[PDB]
Amino acid sequence: EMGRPFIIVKDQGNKKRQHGLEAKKSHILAARSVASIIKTSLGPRGLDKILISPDGEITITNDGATILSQMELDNEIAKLLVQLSKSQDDEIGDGTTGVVVLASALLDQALELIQKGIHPIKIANGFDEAAKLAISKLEETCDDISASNDELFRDFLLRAAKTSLGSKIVSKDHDRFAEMAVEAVINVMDKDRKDVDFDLIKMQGRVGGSISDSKLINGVILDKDFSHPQMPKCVLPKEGSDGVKLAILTCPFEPPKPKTKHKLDISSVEEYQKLQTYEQDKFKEMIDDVKKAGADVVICQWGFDDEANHLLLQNDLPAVRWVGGQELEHIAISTNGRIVPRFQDLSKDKLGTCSRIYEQEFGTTKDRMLIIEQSKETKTVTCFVRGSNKMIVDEAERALHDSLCVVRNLVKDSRVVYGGGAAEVTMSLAVSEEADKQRGIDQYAFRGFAQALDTIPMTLAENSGLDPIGTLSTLKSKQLKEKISNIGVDCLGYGSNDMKELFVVDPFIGKKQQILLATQLCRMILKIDNVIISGK
Amino acid sequence: KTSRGEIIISNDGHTILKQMAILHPVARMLVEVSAAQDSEAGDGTTSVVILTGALLGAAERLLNKGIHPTIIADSFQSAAKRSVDILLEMCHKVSLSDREQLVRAASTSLSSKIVSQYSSFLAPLAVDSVLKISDENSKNVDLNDIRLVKKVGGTIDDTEMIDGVVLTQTAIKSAGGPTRKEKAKIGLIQFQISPPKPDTENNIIVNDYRQMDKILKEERAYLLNICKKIKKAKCNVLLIQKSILRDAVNDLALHFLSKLNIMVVKDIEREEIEFLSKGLGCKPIADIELFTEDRLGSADLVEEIDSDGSKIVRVTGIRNNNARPTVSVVIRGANN
Amino acid sequence: QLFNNSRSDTLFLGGEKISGDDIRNQNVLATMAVANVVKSSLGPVGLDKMLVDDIGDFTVTNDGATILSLLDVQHPAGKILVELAQQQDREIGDGTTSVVIIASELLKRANELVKNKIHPTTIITGFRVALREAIRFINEVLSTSVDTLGKETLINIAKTSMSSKIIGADSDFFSNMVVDALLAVKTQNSKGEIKYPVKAVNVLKAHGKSATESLLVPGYALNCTVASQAMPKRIAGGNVKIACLDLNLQKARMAMGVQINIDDPEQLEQIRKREAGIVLERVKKIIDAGAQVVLTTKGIDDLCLKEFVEAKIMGVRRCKKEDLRRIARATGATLVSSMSNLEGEETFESSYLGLCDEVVQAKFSDDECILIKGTSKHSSSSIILRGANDYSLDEMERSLHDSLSVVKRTLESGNVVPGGGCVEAALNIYLDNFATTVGSREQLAIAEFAAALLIIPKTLAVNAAKDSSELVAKLRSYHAASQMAKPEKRRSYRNYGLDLIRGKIVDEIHAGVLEPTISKVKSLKSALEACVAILRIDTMITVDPE
Amino acid sequence: VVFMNASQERTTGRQAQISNITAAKAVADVIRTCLGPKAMLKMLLDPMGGLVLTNDGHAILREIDVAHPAAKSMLELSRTQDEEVGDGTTTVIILAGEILAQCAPYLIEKNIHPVIIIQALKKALTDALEVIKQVSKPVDVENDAAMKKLIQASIGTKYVIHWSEKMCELALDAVKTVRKDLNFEIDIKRYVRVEKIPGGDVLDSRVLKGVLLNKDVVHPKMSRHIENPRVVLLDCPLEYKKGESQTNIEIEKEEDWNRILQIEEEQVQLMCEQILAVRPTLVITEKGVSDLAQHYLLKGGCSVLRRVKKSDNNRIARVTGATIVNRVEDLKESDVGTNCGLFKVEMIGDEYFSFLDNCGLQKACTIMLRGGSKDILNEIDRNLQDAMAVARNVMLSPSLSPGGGATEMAVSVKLAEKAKQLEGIQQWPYQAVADAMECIPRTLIQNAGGDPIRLLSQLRAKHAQGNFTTGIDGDKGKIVDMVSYGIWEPEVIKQQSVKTAIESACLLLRVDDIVSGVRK
């Protein structure tokens, strides 16, 4: 020190530095603490977890993406696993709990190799080569189901739906949830069975009633009621009609005024009397343009003054007020209408068409909500979920949201796999076989990747109260005797370990990302040497 | 670095774990693992700690696989018993005294110790120390007969086996009459040399001024009569216990011993008598009446050599030659 | 360095434990922090340093023996060189400055050797194999003490030890004082082996005059004050009897813990008069023996002072136990702890009294000392130092103390080596060709060991405010050509060193700079053990006090 | 870790040399006004409250606490001059302070190594002692009129110059009384007794040979005036002696307790009979005296003095010739004080004083100084010790050297001729001593109010004419030689002043670092 203060960087004593074996041990144990949390919620026998927010709100979910999102952490290694499950939920939306267990399994087998004197880059180089060997092996085992017609194609969508609906709360209704999740894509999809638009399906939750009241409604569900509720709640079309002629207007009902600030100077009583007649002539002209166009229900973004309450009541024209701008886009898609910017551009061709417009009483008081139905297949499908608890209505949203993420992935052509742990076991033995041929320094690298894939089937046996040793030994001996890869772990205990008879189906694009996200993340973690963490 | 300021550099894993205070309850159990290794075999305290931590790492993955902990514990006990018979067939018996097997095994057992470079003359040192005690019953070979004395200063190269018992403490030197002693009989005094006093409180009353003249003469006459019996037996070397209760030496007593050139060393540990009695072959004398020539031994040279500020008292040779001898080695080094 | 490591992660310790290269990096900084002091004090061009106790007193100490002793170093590895500097005084007595710089350089250059991943056992073996050949090379290049007809050695031996000290310019005057002081105090033991009891020469502190006028006392000088002023201050005449008594002359209580009980009141006075009469019985035997000077370890009561004045006897009280032992052998007297013999009678024998030429008490600058000169049985010597103040004489006390240890090694072993960087530079060329033979991983360890010894000759030129490279480059030219000088004295090329005053390379034999050979053997072995213990420490564990 | 706990930060290089030179110059700068006959005075305040007002160099340095470590070495230099000689303590610091002031522009400017300068300072010290020896002339040591003018050298600076005519007669008989034939006179300050009596007049004083005691008589009947006094010194107290053995007497019979008190009275009477054997007129003891022993000595006319200082008893034995004997059984007529006379107790309101007048060559004298105040009386005590110290070196060696600026300039002229002949690396540090000897004669001019520029310019031209006796006047500042006015000082004072300055300069120039926090 020589007697003078030596400071290279500001906040010297605040920041700490980790290096050597102690820096690697702290990174592996940070992932083991996150793994043991996720391993308990993995599989249909898993358990949810309570998430307490600083504001007092609680969240109960088993989703690794939602648990880690609201989780307040300290160590940055555990924070890297937060965005790992977030990467799985944002794109694919399925298997967020599997990427955390598989990534920590790669780090657990890597810690044993580091203690043996293997350079960390040599460990990462072995996982990258072993990742492509597992994907190429599973790609050859699966078959293309696109040869079937649309009748059988709906069955494969029901197969993968019931799989993603498990492991989450309110899993007893999955039979009806699987039917409603597939019919949403049947109505909204391209004729070529490609590149379906997910944004056309909206998730609208409602708190009340019971879960048995959840049903599909094609249309728009708004939180605003009819203005001046002297009109009938349920609107009915005319005897003969082309439709209801729904009208959408982003302009409130007011006498025309310049957008710029204006000054209207009245210098005489005669000029003031003309403003009186000019005022009432505009409200009379605006209500006549809607009647001449045949429209019935009028939608206003900014609402309208109380002058038009009785004016629209004489002509029997329903009206709503204070509709959000984002909801206006949702309205024009369902009824196939066009937003009319002003009465001068109002025409009968820009009016939307829906089957019926009505409101429901829901509970005792609550609030008034508007419901729109369609008379045929349209591009808008709105999900309707009910529940007796605020936590159930919440989790059921993301439960069906992740279920829709599995169906939209099946829209991609020629990608299917069977779940239940049958995919990880098939890809595990293919990597261990290459280790005997390659040998060399990387022989131990393929062994660590093969033992990491078997952790997912062994984790399923823990939540089901089975023996992970006896279960894994049966799966490994089955793949060696016969080439059938469809044998896997059964957590429901229905027998028939063949996935073909149990109908369990998963997307291949979901399982392919689990290996890529786990392998590529561990490659960056093993490269970390000096850890500088500043004090909060 | 300990809490009291003492700094210990130790290769042995037992001292490393003992001097280090561990806050974890179970991690302190490894400290006593090296204790059992050092108490029985005495070697391998570092390996037994690593083998214990290695079995825990192998059994760590076995817990998540559905194996009961007692099954893991019963599996290691059955495997450890089988591992004993593995080493019984590979080991080879050796002769009672072999310079080839004992020296090569002693230098190898040092391994990373700082004395490995000094193991040239140190390997025969540890071998010849044990060969002095030989038995067919395979006794534990008590190390109390082998005394390693530490002296500050010098180099480790100067370490060598002493042909006789070495004394840690130096001479009184108050009288300092004899410079060097040759062909002397080493005595052992378990009593105290002083003017006569009971071991309990006493009173001496002087009723006449002529009585004090006899007191000063008779107090010196008692110390004089002790030197008479020592001179008749020709005992030139005396060793006295600490005797914290009663003064062991006196200015009048050391002056009487300076005329006869008798070297006396005091402040000797009480537990070291077994090393002094068996090594020098001298029976301790606890009474002036029991003092005789038969209890005294023989020593060729008793001297105190001051070398580079380090003073040490060494004895060369023992003419007793009793049933079993003792080992005496003086350790020197630059750093304490 | 950099940022502090995390504290006990999964380790569960109460103290601080750091692992990796951070321990060896702090161990080097510990030896480099204590080296920068000793560095500037090396060589005749070195400068003294002043240490302060914050209590108002200052301490001027040139050598690193007392400097490291006074400075508190709490670093665990830093205490090694602190104990090493205190050690060098015990064996050789000189070289505390060179042993610290060499031991600190062996660790400094080894810090780059561990970055090569070379294991310390290879580094330690490289230093030990190079040391075994270095000690043998020193024994080959030594010179005999014969030289010319006359001595011309012991005078030049002291001049080397007087370097680096303020009295170095006066070394020509102090050269004859150190040689004549040790030859007078020599003894004999081990049946013909001559021993040199260092510290037997009394070092007195006086003020006034100058260090060049300091007179060598042909005899022992006792530091003490006269008992009574009525005693004669100077005693003349031949055969002066001196009595050395360790027995108390003051009146003491009867026995220790007894109690005096008197019944007849007529005996109350007679018993008390006997207590004071027994003490004067030992004085009556001294007066009748003709003892001129009575030396007593403890004090002297007034009862014994009246008998010395009437008999013209010089009493002395409060004498050091170690001082009277040297007076007994010098004057020939026998130390008397008490008056008694094998017979029951008590008497004083005249054989216990010593003899000398003259006993006189000198007083200079508040310092009173009795000068005992002309001891017939065994000669002695004493040196009276004169300087500015007591602290100015504190450095002069240790300057002459180190000179007595250097001359002792030359008389016991006549083998000496030239100083001024001759040994350190000669070992470099010898180990250059030796490292190429072994090769493998030990070639770099031996090469760094030869370069580590270059710190001593380079430090001489740095502290002299001159160009170091031109002095070292010309230095190697003689040593590199000395190994290749080849047989046929015409060899030469050896025993050359740096002259810091004139800035030239001249022969150290004609310059009068020599150093004992044993000083190089004990220094290289002690400096290596300090570096070996540091290179072997992987992890430092510091436990907080409870 | 912190490594070294004592001054982990270090100040080395030219920064440490400047701090040592600047602090050493500040020590000499404060005493510049303390040199010369016109010199001022300095007042000091101790933490105890005692005020010390003097122009002496040593008394100022030792009473000032200096926090600078190297500047404390300057404080102890005056102690070397005071203990060995006692005169010239001011010129030592002024000379030593000027050397480092002149030697400063070398390490910084010329970059000359200190040891190179030290080798030049030692060679210049040897040549300086030869110049002082050549300018010194021997004088008669047995001449009383010649020694009176030599003591006035140190008196001319002190305030006692008004009484100098009277002060020389006090210091002359004081040194001559305690000296004796044997290292020549071997006189010691411990034999000279200086008693400080407040009040009186300085013009009225006398040298009294004896010991002046402030203790009164133990009994009123004791005669305060004795024609032929006889002094017997006794270290044993006249009180009843008790054995240290802690003797406990068990009293049984009724006549045992009454006998103990009688025996105590018989021994006290017995010890008085041992004293009355020689029949002394006076009794002096250093311990207490019981009231019982007072009556037994009234019949013999023995005046008893109690609680006398221990060192005073040794001074009584010199004047009275008595031998100190502790036991009363060894008292003989030879041990009784003889030749003493004029024993009288003068009555003064403050204290009772006892006078002694003498008729084995060692004697003693007690000088009674009467001042105007207690603090001024402390100044005359210090001025009397420095006045007697001048006569010591005159009696030791006949050598006598000039002073007042003549000796300091005589050395600088000789150093200028040899400097140009060196032609080497040591020429620059060799010229530092020549300019360092100029501070003392320059200081005398600055304190006198003259112009040092024109006086010192013509002063060096005078020494080139071959006369070493040219000084500098302290009043008019004339260039007239010192032979006319008569300033002369012993050579020992000139040697100890030069030797101390050279040895001290080499000490501070070798300090390259200053560290603290050791706390030994």
mmCIF file of C-alpha atoms in Angstrom, chain C residues 221-410:
data_model
loop_
_atom_site.group_PDB
_atom_site.id
_atom_site.type_symbol
_atom_site.label_atom_id
_atom_site.label_comp_id
_atom_site.label_asym_id
_atom_site.label_seq_id
_atom_site.Cartn_x
_atom_site.Cartn_y
_atom_site.Cartn_z
ATOM 1 C CA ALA C 221 35.581 0.719 33.225
ATOM 2 C CA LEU C 222 32.731 0.274 35.706
ATOM 3 C CA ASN C 223 29.716 2.578 35.375
ATOM 4 C CA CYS C 224 28.514 3.561 38.865
ATOM 5 C CA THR C 225 28.767 6.282 41.504
ATOM 6 C CA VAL C 226 30.953 6.445 44.600
ATOM 7 C CA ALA C 227 29.271 5.379 47.846
ATOM 8 C CA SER C 228 30.470 8.193 50.123
ATOM 9 C CA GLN C 229 32.181 11.446 49.186
ATOM 10 C CA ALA C 230 34.589 11.139 52.135
ATOM 11 C CA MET C 231 36.306 8.207 50.412
ATOM 12 C CA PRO C 232 39.530 8.897 48.476
ATOM 13 C CA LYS C 233 38.698 9.562 44.837
ATOM 14 C CA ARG C 234 41.952 8.130 43.428
ATOM 15 C CA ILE C 235 43.898 5.075 44.610
ATOM 16 C CA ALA C 236 47.536 4.692 43.553
ATOM 17 C CA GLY C 237 50.262 2.130 44.139
ATOM 18 C CA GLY C 238 50.749 -1.346 42.770
ATOM 19 C CA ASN C 239 48.810 -4.481 43.713
ATOM 20 C CA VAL C 240 45.415 -2.942 44.433
ATOM 21 C CA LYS C 241 43.140 -5.487 46.104
ATOM 22 C CA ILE C 242 39.535 -5.587 44.862
ATOM 23 C CA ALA C 243 36.723 -7.392 46.696
ATOM 24 C CA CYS C 244 33.640 -8.559 44.777
ATOM 25 C CA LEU C 245 30.800 -9.528 47.127
ATOM 26 C CA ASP C 246 27.255 -10.519 46.166
ATOM 27 C CA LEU C 247 26.101 -10.468 49.808
ATOM 28 C CA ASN C 248 23.931 -7.707 51.245
ATOM 29 C CA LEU C 249 25.855 -5.268 53.435
ATOM 30 C CA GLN C 250 22.635 -3.608 54.627
ATOM 31 C CA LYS C 251 20.988 -4.651 57.877
ATOM 32 C CA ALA C 252 18.318 -7.274 57.192
ATOM 33 C CA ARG C 253 15.545 -8.820 59.257
ATOM 34 C CA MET C 254 16.173 -12.058 61.132
ATOM 35 C CA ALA C 255 15.427 -15.069 58.882
ATOM 36 C CA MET C 256 12.321 -14.326 56.761
ATOM 37 C CA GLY C 257 8.926 -15.041 58.331
ATOM 38 C CA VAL C 258 9.860 -15.805 61.954
ATOM 39 C CA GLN C 259 8.894 -13.690 64.971
ATOM 40 C CA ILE C 260 11.137 -12.379 67.746
ATOM 41 C CA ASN C 261 9.592 -12.860 71.199
ATOM 42 C CA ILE C 262 11.518 -11.491 74.191
ATOM 43 C CA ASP C 263 10.554 -12.147 77.816
ATOM 44 C CA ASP C 264 13.341 -10.613 79.918
ATOM 45 C CA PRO C 265 13.373 -6.877 79.058
ATOM 46 C CA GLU C 266 17.087 -6.672 79.924
ATOM 47 C CA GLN C 267 17.832 -8.673 76.752
ATOM 48 C CA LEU C 268 15.760 -6.379 74.511
ATOM 49 C CA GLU C 269 18.751 -4.134 73.791
ATOM 50 C CA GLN C 270 21.430 -6.846 73.686
ATOM 51 C CA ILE C 271 19.570 -8.862 71.039
ATOM 52 C CA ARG C 272 19.116 -5.796 68.824
ATOM 53 C CA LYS C 273 22.787 -4.808 69.135
ATOM 54 C CA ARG C 274 23.801 -8.253 67.860
ATOM 55 C CA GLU C 275 21.801 -7.856 64.636
ATOM 56 C CA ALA C 276 23.890 -4.812 63.698
ATOM 57 C CA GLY C 277 27.113 -6.442 64.908
ATOM 58 C CA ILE C 278 26.930 -9.544 62.714
ATOM 59 C CA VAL C 279 26.934 -7.390 59.571
ATOM 60 C CA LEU C 280 30.135 -5.599 60.613
ATOM 61 C CA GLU C 281 31.897 -8.926 61.247
ATOM 62 C CA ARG C 282 32.249 -9.504 57.500
ATOM 63 C CA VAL C 283 33.586 -5.960 57.096
ATOM 64 C CA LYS C 284 36.249 -6.473 59.782
ATOM 65 C CA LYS C 285 37.692 -9.409 57.829
ATOM 66 C CA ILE C 286 37.845 -7.256 54.686
ATOM 67 C CA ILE C 287 39.650 -4.358 56.381
ATOM 68 C CA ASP C 288 42.235 -6.703 57.911
ATOM 69 C CA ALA C 289 42.758 -8.299 54.482
ATOM 70 C CA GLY C 290 43.814 -4.979 52.948
ATOM 71 C CA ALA C 291 41.131 -4.706 50.261
ATOM 72 C CA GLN C 292 41.284 -1.251 48.682
ATOM 73 C CA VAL C 293 38.055 -1.478 46.642
ATOM 74 C CA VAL C 294 34.934 -3.334 47.803
ATOM 75 C CA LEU C 295 32.432 -4.092 45.032
ATOM 76 C CA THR C 296 28.929 -5.004 46.229
ATOM 77 C CA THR C 297 26.021 -6.080 44.031
ATOM 78 C CA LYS C 298 23.334 -4.587 46.285
ATOM 79 C CA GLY C 299 23.342 -1.387 48.334
ATOM 80 C CA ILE C 300 25.566 -0.533 51.285
ATOM 81 C CA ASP C 301 24.162 0.631 54.618
ATOM 82 C CA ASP C 302 25.679 3.561 56.508
ATOM 83 C CA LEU C 303 27.092 1.128 59.090
ATOM 84 C CA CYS C 304 29.554 -0.172 56.480
ATOM 85 C CA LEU C 305 30.407 3.292 55.120
ATOM 86 C CA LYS C 306 32.075 4.564 58.303
ATOM 87 C CA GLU C 307 34.500 1.623 58.325
ATOM 88 C CA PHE C 308 35.552 2.214 54.707
ATOM 89 C CA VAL C 309 36.344 5.910 55.213
ATOM 90 C CA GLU C 310 38.478 5.312 58.312
ATOM 91 C CA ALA C 311 40.345 2.487 56.545
ATOM 92 C CA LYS C 312 40.593 4.457 53.258
ATOM 93 C CA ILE C 313 38.556 1.863 51.348
ATOM 94 C CA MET C 314 36.425 2.663 48.295
ATOM 95 C CA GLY C 315 32.959 1.155 48.582
ATOM 96 C CA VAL C 316 30.686 0.655 45.577
ATOM 97 C CA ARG C 317 26.995 -0.282 45.655
ATOM 98 C CA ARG C 318 24.285 -1.206 43.137
ATOM 99 C CA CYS C 319 26.595 -3.184 40.848
ATOM 100 C CA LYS C 320 25.269 -5.207 37.930
ATOM 101 C CA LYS C 321 25.630 -8.971 38.297
ATOM 102 C CA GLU C 322 27.057 -9.355 34.784
ATOM 103 C CA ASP C 323 29.551 -6.526 35.370
ATOM 104 C CA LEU C 324 31.177 -8.032 38.469
ATOM 105 C CA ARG C 325 31.752 -11.377 36.735
ATOM 106 C CA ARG C 326 34.010 -9.676 34.183
ATOM 107 C CA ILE C 327 35.823 -7.793 36.958
ATOM 108 C CA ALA C 328 36.565 -11.029 38.827
ATOM 109 C CA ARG C 329 38.270 -12.750 35.892
ATOM 110 C CA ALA C 330 40.119 -9.624 34.736
ATOM 111 C CA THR C 331 41.512 -8.616 38.138
ATOM 112 C CA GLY C 332 41.909 -12.264 39.181
ATOM 113 C CA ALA C 333 39.461 -12.063 42.086
ATOM 114 C CA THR C 334 36.983 -14.838 42.867
ATOM 115 C CA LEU C 335 33.298 -13.945 43.073
ATOM 116 C CA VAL C 336 32.110 -14.356 46.669
ATOM 117 C CA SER C 337 28.384 -14.818 47.232
ATOM 118 C CA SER C 338 28.913 -15.500 50.948
ATOM 119 C CA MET C 339 31.769 -16.034 53.394
ATOM 120 C CA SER C 340 32.089 -19.735 54.290
ATOM 121 C CA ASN C 341 34.034 -22.878 53.408
ATOM 122 C CA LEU C 342 33.886 -26.650 53.852
ATOM 123 C CA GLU C 343 34.757 -26.306 57.541
ATOM 124 C CA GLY C 344 32.192 -25.084 60.050
ATOM 125 C CA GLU C 345 34.241 -21.969 60.788
ATOM 126 C CA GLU C 346 33.711 -18.708 58.897
ATOM 127 C CA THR C 347 36.711 -16.730 57.658
ATOM 128 C CA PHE C 348 37.886 -14.659 54.699
ATOM 129 C CA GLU C 349 40.847 -15.781 52.588
ATOM 130 C CA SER C 350 43.147 -13.336 50.802
ATOM 131 C CA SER C 351 43.115 -15.472 47.634
ATOM 132 C CA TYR C 352 39.646 -14.130 46.755
ATOM 133 C CA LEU C 353 41.097 -10.630 46.241
ATOM 134 C CA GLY C 354 42.250 -9.432 42.831
ATOM 135 C CA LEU C 355 45.193 -7.296 41.764
ATOM 136 C CA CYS C 356 45.600 -4.426 39.309
ATOM 137 C CA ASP C 357 47.873 -1.453 38.667
ATOM 138 C CA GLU C 358 45.565 1.461 39.504
ATOM 139 C CA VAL C 359 41.940 2.215 40.387
ATOM 140 C CA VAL C 360 40.691 5.723 39.577
ATOM 141 C CA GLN C 361 37.194 7.187 39.190
ATOM 142 C CA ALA C 362 36.711 9.554 36.245
ATOM 143 C CA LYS C 363 33.821 12.016 35.902
ATOM 144 C CA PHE C 364 33.010 13.515 32.493
ATOM 145 C CA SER C 365 29.682 15.155 31.591
ATOM 146 C CA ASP C 366 27.689 13.864 34.589
ATOM 147 C CA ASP C 367 28.969 10.362 33.769
ATOM 148 C CA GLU C 368 30.922 8.897 36.695
ATOM 149 C CA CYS C 369 32.964 5.775 35.956
ATOM 150 C CA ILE C 370 35.720 3.914 37.796
ATOM 151 C CA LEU C 371 38.693 3.185 35.527
ATOM 152 C CA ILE C 372 40.382 -0.130 36.370
ATOM 153 C CA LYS C 373 43.631 -0.409 34.413
ATOM 154 C CA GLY C 374 46.604 -2.752 34.421
ATOM 155 C CA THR C 375 44.980 -6.066 35.311
ATOM 156 C CA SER C 376 47.781 -8.582 35.836
ATOM 157 C CA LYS C 377 45.900 -11.887 35.577
ATOM 158 C CA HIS C 378 43.739 -11.180 32.513
ATOM 159 C CA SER C 379 43.644 -8.034 30.397
ATOM 160 C CA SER C 380 40.430 -6.196 29.530
ATOM 161 C CA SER C 381 39.325 -3.155 27.546
ATOM 162 C CA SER C 382 36.677 -0.438 27.495
ATOM 163 C CA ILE C 383 35.600 2.224 25.000
ATOM 164 C CA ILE C 384 34.279 5.656 26.003
ATOM 165 C CA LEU C 385 32.167 7.166 23.223
ATOM 166 C CA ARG C 386 31.687 10.929 22.929
ATOM 167 C CA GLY C 387 29.033 12.568 20.792
ATOM 168 C CA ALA C 388 26.301 15.175 20.490
ATOM 169 C CA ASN C 389 23.691 13.631 22.803
ATOM 170 C CA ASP C 390 22.633 10.259 24.199
ATOM 171 C CA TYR C 391 20.605 9.451 21.079
ATOM 172 C CA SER C 392 23.584 10.367 18.893
ATOM 173 C CA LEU C 393 25.599 7.825 20.903
ATOM 174 C CA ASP C 394 22.858 5.188 20.588
ATOM 175 C CA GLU C 395 23.827 4.664 16.946
ATOM 176 C CA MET C 396 27.528 4.740 17.843
ATOM 177 C CA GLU C 397 26.880 2.065 20.483
ATOM 178 C CA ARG C 398 25.429 -0.356 17.923
ATOM 179 C CA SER C 399 28.006 0.690 15.314
ATOM 180 C CA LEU C 400 30.886 -0.587 17.453
ATOM 181 C CA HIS C 401 28.806 -3.579 18.576
ATOM 182 C CA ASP C 402 28.487 -4.842 14.998
ATOM 183 C CA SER C 403 32.215 -4.279 14.440
ATOM 184 C CA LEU C 404 33.080 -6.666 17.281
ATOM 185 C CA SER C 405 31.061 -9.463 15.659
ATOM 186 C CA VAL C 406 32.737 -9.052 12.257
ATOM 187 C CA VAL C 407 36.283 -9.215 13.641
ATOM 188 C CA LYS C 408 35.301 -12.278 15.692
ATOM 189 C CA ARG C 409 34.482 -14.246 12.535
ATOM 190 C CA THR C 410 37.802 -13.345 10.889
#
